[PDB]
Design an enzyme around this catalytic site. Sequence first.
Site, PDB file in Angstrom:
ATOM      1  CD1 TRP A  65      -2.135  -2.173   0.369  1.00  0.00           C
ATOM      2  CD2 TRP A  65      -3.107  -1.190   2.126  1.00  0.00           C
ATOM      3  NE1 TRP A  65      -3.228  -2.926   0.710  1.00  0.00           N
ATOM      4  CE2 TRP A  65      -3.834  -2.357   1.800  1.00  0.00           C
ATOM      5  CE3 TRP A  65      -3.529  -0.413   3.214  1.00  0.00           C
ATOM      6  CZ2 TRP A  65      -4.981  -2.745   2.514  1.00  0.00           C
ATOM      7  CZ3 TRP A  65      -4.662  -0.800   3.916  1.00  0.00           C
ATOM      8  CH2 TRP A  65      -5.370  -1.953   3.564  1.00  0.00           C
ATOM      9  CG  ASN A 162      -7.890  -2.479   0.736  1.00  0.00           C
ATOM     10  OD1 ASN A 162      -7.802  -3.604   0.293  1.00  0.00           O
ATOM     11  ND2 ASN A 162      -8.361  -2.212   1.944  1.00  0.00           N
ATOM     12  CD  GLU A 163     -11.568  -4.649   2.207  1.00  0.00           C
ATOM     13  OE1 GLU A 163     -11.994  -4.045   3.204  1.00  0.00           O
ATOM     14  OE2 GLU A 163     -11.204  -5.857   2.219  1.00  0.00           O
ATOM     15  CD1 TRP A 191     -15.682  -0.805   7.694  1.00  0.00           C
ATOM     16  CD2 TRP A 191     -16.616  -1.870   5.960  1.00  0.00           C
ATOM     17  NE1 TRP A 191     -14.681  -1.110   6.805  1.00  0.00           N
ATOM     18  CE2 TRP A 191     -15.227  -1.757   5.729  1.00  0.00           C
ATOM     19  CE3 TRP A 191     -17.412  -2.510   5.002  1.00  0.00           C
ATOM     20  CZ2 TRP A 191     -14.609  -2.269   4.578  1.00  0.00           C
ATOM     21  CZ3 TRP A 191     -16.799  -3.015   3.857  1.00  0.00           C
ATOM     22  CH2 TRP A 191     -15.416  -2.887   3.655  1.00  0.00           C
ATOM     23  CD1 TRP A 226     -16.301  -6.197   2.662  1.00  0.00           C
ATOM     24  CD2 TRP A 226     -17.507  -5.705   0.840  1.00  0.00           C
ATOM     25  NE1 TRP A 226     -17.607  -6.463   2.941  1.00  0.00           N
ATOM     26  CE2 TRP A 226     -18.375  -6.172   1.847  1.00  0.00           C
ATOM     27  CE3 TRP A 226     -18.050  -5.337  -0.396  1.00  0.00           C
ATOM     28  CZ2 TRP A 226     -19.749  -6.279   1.657  1.00  0.00           C
ATOM     29  CZ3 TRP A 226     -19.415  -5.448  -0.585  1.00  0.00           C
ATOM     30  CH2 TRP A 226     -20.253  -5.922   0.434  1.00  0.00           C
ATOM     31  CE1 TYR A 265      -9.188 -11.839   5.517  1.00  0.00           C
ATOM     32  CE2 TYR A 265     -10.521 -10.229   4.365  1.00  0.00           C
ATOM     33  CZ  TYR A 265      -9.274 -10.682   4.779  1.00  0.00           C
ATOM     34  OH  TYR A 265      -8.094 -10.015   4.511  1.00  0.00           O
ATOM     35  CD  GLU A 294      -7.260  -7.608   1.895  1.00  0.00           C
ATOM     36  OE1 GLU A 294      -8.054  -7.866   2.836  1.00  0.00           O
ATOM     37  OE2 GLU A 294      -6.880  -6.434   1.632  1.00  0.00           O
ATOM     38  CD1 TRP A 323      -4.905  -9.586   6.749  1.00  0.00           C
ATOM     39  CD2 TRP A 323      -4.447  -8.252   5.006  1.00  0.00           C
ATOM     40  NE1 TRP A 323      -4.803  -8.294   7.217  1.00  0.00           N
ATOM     41  CE2 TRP A 323      -4.509  -7.463   6.165  1.00  0.00           C
ATOM     42  CE3 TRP A 323      -4.156  -7.637   3.785  1.00  0.00           C
ATOM     43  CZ2 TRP A 323      -4.297  -6.084   6.138  1.00  0.00           C
ATOM     44  CZ3 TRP A 323      -3.963  -6.263   3.763  1.00  0.00           C
ATOM     45  CH2 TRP A 323      -4.020  -5.510   4.927  1.00  0.00           C
TER      46      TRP A 323
END
Length: 353
Positions: A65, A162-163, A191, A226, A265, A294, A323
Amino acid sequence: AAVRLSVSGTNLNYNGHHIFLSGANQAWVNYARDFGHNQYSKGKSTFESTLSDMQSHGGNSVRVWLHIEGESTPEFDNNGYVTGIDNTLISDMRAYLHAAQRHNILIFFTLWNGAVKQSTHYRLNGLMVDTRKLQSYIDHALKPMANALKNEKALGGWDIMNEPEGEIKPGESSSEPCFDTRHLSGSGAGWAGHLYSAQEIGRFVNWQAAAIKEVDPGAMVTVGSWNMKADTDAMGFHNLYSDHCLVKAGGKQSGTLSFYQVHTYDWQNHFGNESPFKHSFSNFRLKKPMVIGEFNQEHGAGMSSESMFEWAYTKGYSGAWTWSRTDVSWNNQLRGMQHLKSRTDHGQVQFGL
């Protein structure tokens, strides 16, 4: 002028041979302060030891990043416009790329982060909602960087953000199906805040993708999504990152991604039905390669690191990045990479740059 990394349909190639990207997210050493202002020299020993570890275990790529939310790079004026980059940013990035080359590893730089909203968020916010601010970033930072580094053999490519769904507005109806976010209601999206419309995110990605490809037409460009709910038109969902959606959002015909990247995840020890670990790549009806960008065994619903790398490699995906170097078990990640080290049945993993 030889072509190095390229895309053919839903496969990735290197020097015209089918490859698979296997490796890890760094994703940082000193968060948002790793490059520029002579900062690489400070983290060089960690970056180099990570490269050494990975080469010996058969990894071939690292995601790192870069700006994040604009804490240290690029340079901003008092109104949120970008004025340039500091005089060691490019030379720091080049030193890292030379180290990676010595270990046969490709680097993917991630420009921005949408997963957390911290004290310099206003800098990124301006670029998201004000097209004239976005253009200043493109002209004064992104193009100079992409042009300067394009002949480095260890440069894999660029991830715009990212996301982004961290900051999307869920539950919104639209006359354009790909901007409709009703399917994200109850998903957890937004979120970090209900800040940006689907169209705003699409424009942000479209314009930066077009900019990179203007100065480095052969560059690989992606976005780290995500969840699959935002990255497929199958299963009752919508793909925010398709060519059609991005061009409708921002208007730049060249502003399309090279490949897709999705994160996954488990939750309470089970994967949801949308997860790429519950289906083959072909289930999602995509026309570009997909990297699982990830994941880890700690959130893998009982799957070993080896099984997760195996699923990605054999079920039609084009890469797998765990990750991360900073988080959970590094040995678990290296053991996963090592499982693919000698493999050629679904593309070469060990190839020379």
